[PDB]
């Protein structure tokens with residue numbers, strides 16, 4: 001059934017997953033000296049290429065490949081269009097490793113054919129709370145605690161093969177080369193998400209969408225006018241009304257995050273994320289990188305009253321190309337990123353997210369039901385979408401957990 005995935009160190013079935021009771025490695029402890037120094041073999045007409053993702057020209061080459069060949073829906077209506085600024089931000093966080101950005105080029109015409117990228121993350125990934133309780137009940141707490149400390153691992157994303165090269169087994173080769181380069185830095189696990197089902201997720205969460213510009217979303221066929229609105233004289237007028245938002249934020253003391261907010265935001269985020277079984281640990285430099293506003297890419301606001309920051313939210317932007325429409329070219333989507341609420345309810349904080357996103361001309365706000373995102377779905381008029389995102393580890397056995405126990409946002 002899976003000629004590549006069956007050869008890799010990951011749980012092979014739900015049955016196998018169900019037997020997993022402690023966090024820990026799937027495979028044999030190995031060393032850097034055990035790993036081939038020579039790149040993985042590749043066809044004599046292709047070559048490995050390491051782009052410099054801080055150099056505008058190399059970022060643009062990778063941007064075009066993704067623009068034309070990255071994730072699209074089954075009806076070929078929308079294709080992700082991650083921007084050049086967004087790619088530099090996502091792929092070059094503090095202490096990133098340039099050698100983890102891996103491409104294939106055709107030698108003859110230097111045509112870019114494929115890409116995959118890894119970035120460092122410090123991740124809590126030890127046994128989850130409900131399996132620690134089961135371990136305690138059996139007298140097995142020692143074994144359950146062995147990997148509690150945060151681990152420096154790899155997050156993999158942006159795997160892409162050009163449409164002309166599909167179904168030629170190029171993705172496994174890219175994956176094997178990326179794994180070699182990661183293991184050559186003495187890192188042996190990765191985390192990754194996909195919309196497709198592979199062997200074997202440790203968590204899965206549904207998509208949610210919140211309409212901001214319903215007339216545009218219906219015109220581009222992202223949305224339809226739902227059946228119950230057909231009982232009205234003007235179904236679209238009533239749809240617009242249903243999704244209408246204030247034109248300015250409601251929370252007093254809301255303002256953009258600045259560098260001087262970094263220690264307070266780090267404090268309240270890390271206290272919040274601690275409560276979840278799987279979550280990142282961010283340094284001041286990582287908080288700066290992932291949360292300070294960056295035009296067109298990430299938008300972050302704090303609630304500051306009487307000189308103290310007590311709450312914050314962030315969202316990021318990814319436009320999608322609208323593959324067939326005379327009126328519009330782009331779907332401008334805002335995605336819920338990290339947040340923390342200590343002074344106001346989460347729904348009141350995220351209402352201001354929606355207000356800001358709508359004021360800035362976003363068409364839809366999207367998120368996955370991770371974190372406490374279920375706590376404001378109904379009041380804020382999010383609806384579930386189709387399909388499931390799925391969280392995976394490479395070379396890590398992990399008990400199945402609920403998505404409300406995952407705190408890692410995946411870009």
Ligand SMILES: CCCCCCCCCCCCCC(=O)SCCNC(=O)CCNC(=O)[C@H](O)C(C)(C)COP(=O)(O)OP(=O)(O)OC[C@H]1O[C@@H](n2cnc3c(N)ncnc32)[C@H](O)[C@@H]1OP(=O)(O)O
Pocket residue numbers: 001002003004005006069070071072154156157158159160161162165166167168169170171172175178179182183187188189190192193194195196198394395
């Ligand atoms: C310690 C460090 C470890 C580092 C590595 C950790 C692992 C990271 C794993 C990567 C995580 C990436 C996270 C993201 O970026 S998820 C986003 C993935 N990208 C897209 O969906 C963009 C559009 N599609 C494509 O570009 C191609 O269709 C891809 C590149 C997806 C496959 O190309 P193609 O269609 O030409 O097929 P092939 O003949 O070359 O290969 C067929 C094999 O590939 C397996 N396949 C198909 N889709 C995926 C997928 N999304 N993750 C993992 N495996 C996938 C498939 O089951 C089959 O294996 P098996 O079933 O035969 O066994």
Ligand SMILES: N[C@@H](CC(=O)N1C[C@@H](CO)[C@H](c2ccc(Cl)cc2)C1)Cc1ccc(Cl)cc1
Pocket residue numbers: 071156157158192193194195207208209318335366367368385389410411
């Ligand atoms: N490594 C994956 C990351 C992921 O699954 N995401 C990225 C996230 C956008 O930042 C997207 C998403 C899509 C829709 C909603 Cl409502 C929320 C998040 C899922 C690659 C990917 C990207 C997009 C999709 Cl739809 C499926 C897989």
Ligand SMILES: [Mg+2]
Pocket residue numbers: 161165166167168169170171
């Ligand atoms: Mg292929």
